[PDB]
């Protein structure tokens, strides 16, 4: 009884965002892969540090809340203000949408980039069950499983 | 203020080296001192306390907008260096992957 990411995500995985869950003579093991999870975290961070950046343009008063201005000039100010409100509100909702899609698709990319690495490692010694696991056709003790994780499997 | 008279205040900017000439024979409120500008400031209108303990850079009538987030849904008239006012109250940026729960078997 063990499964991969083609199905569901593991909730027991807490050292990182991706990991190996193996099964052999000595039993189950769940250990995160550090390189892949940092590569995902460091790109979401790259987004934050680009959008959190501040604007250094200072705007002053042109309206007057206490003492109203000419109806014409005020109406035109209101017209411009509400028009700018519409642009930023649009540019905002879209940016969140795009970056949320690029974020979601970013993490999926790094899961496969790890799955397709372990695949080339095992060469002709294992098969794809189809659910994100590898049926290994040779006895693999707890030491051999860790050789797959730290990229030493021969 | 009990007086049905009215005083109309006018103003002009006298260029350096220029002269303003007043010719009158009554009904003239006269200037005693001319005013000169000092430096840079920022005019805000408000209705809340001043607080020298907290440091801020964005002002609306209800106080100070202190934030790193690029948007704000507080006041469309805030002055200073401010986040952009947007119609929406909340826009959630994903900082994590798609959450797919787990099932036992």
């Amino acid at each position: 009884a063990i499964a991969g990411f083609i199905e569901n995500g593991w909730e027991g995985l807490i050292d990182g965002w991706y990991g190996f869950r193996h099964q052999n003579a000595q039993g189950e093991g769940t250990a995160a892969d550090y390189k892949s999870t940092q590569s995902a975290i460091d790109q979401i961070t790259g987004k934050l540090n680009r959008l959190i950046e501040k604007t250094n343009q200072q705007f002053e008063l042109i309206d007057n809340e206490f003492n109203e201005v000419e109806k014409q000039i005020g109406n035109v100010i209101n017209w411009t203000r509400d028009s700018i409100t519409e642009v930023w509100s649009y540019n905002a909702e879209l940016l969140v949408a795009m970056e949320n899609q690029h974020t979601i698709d970013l993490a999926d990319s790094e899961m496969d980039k790890l799955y397709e690495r372990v695949k080339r490692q095992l060469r002709e010694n294992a098969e794809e069950d189809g659910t994100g696991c590898f049926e290994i056709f040779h006895k693999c003790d707890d030491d051999c499983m860790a050789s797959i994780r730290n990229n030493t499997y021969d | 203020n009990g007086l049905s008279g009215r005083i109309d205040f006018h103003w002009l900017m006298l260029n350096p080296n220029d002269t303003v000439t007043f010719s009158f024979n009554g009904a003239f409120i006269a200037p005693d001192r001319a005013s000169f500008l000092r430096g840079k400031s920022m005019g805000i209108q408000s209705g809340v306390q001043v607080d020298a303990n907290c440091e801020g850079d964005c002002y609306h009538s209800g106080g100070t907008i202190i934030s790193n987030l690029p948007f704000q849904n507080i006041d469309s008239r805030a002055v200073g260096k401010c986040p952009r006012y947007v119609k929406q109250r909340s826009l959630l940026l994903a900082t994590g992957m798609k959450n797919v729960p787990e099932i036992p078997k």
Partner: antibody
Amino acid sequence: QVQLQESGPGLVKPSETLSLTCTVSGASVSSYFWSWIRQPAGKALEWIGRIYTSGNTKSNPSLESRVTMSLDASKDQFSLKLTSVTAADTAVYYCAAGRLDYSDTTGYYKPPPLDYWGQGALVTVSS
Amino acid sequence: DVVMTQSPLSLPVTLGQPASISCRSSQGLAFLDGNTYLSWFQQRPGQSPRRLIYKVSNRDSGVPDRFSGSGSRTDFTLKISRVEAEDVGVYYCMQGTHWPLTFGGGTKVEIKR
């Protein structure tokens, strides 16, 4: 109620294995991030690496080829080994600890906080 | 590597006067958890450095009132409200968001008495 005490040779020969060890007083090693920060004679602080129980010796690239960290949970001592030592590795070697929240999944992928420090050990590298 | 640059590099102040220290990072220091991890460290004569400010603004417990941290995402400032004779020493800033931990050059504060 926690204290970190460095210990080890005061001088190590050029190309030896500089070894040091931070002994923990009044706390469990299992519950912290463990950093080694070295300060050469009158220079900026240099952060060597950090480890935590269950292993993850994340280290600075300048020294990663030569750094080796491990920590014993029964003797309560962070340890450190810098192989092939140079005159550049002559420095004060403070060890440091940082809070470790098990559930903060995103905390293992961020440099650890530097909550507590030791007195610092001088390792002069000469012959 | 994130580059921590402090200024000034020697800050002689007058016993009981205020002063500030600017630390500019080569990169933004935000993290996924919403906190920007900049810290300020004070290393006094012949001692281990101790942490004054963590997370840009939060002051650590057991530290004089006059230490208040501030900053944005690239530009940060340590403010001392009233430097007394006991604040002599070297002051560092460290980013704590990006591998590896990096420290500022350090500012030498010497009291003018």
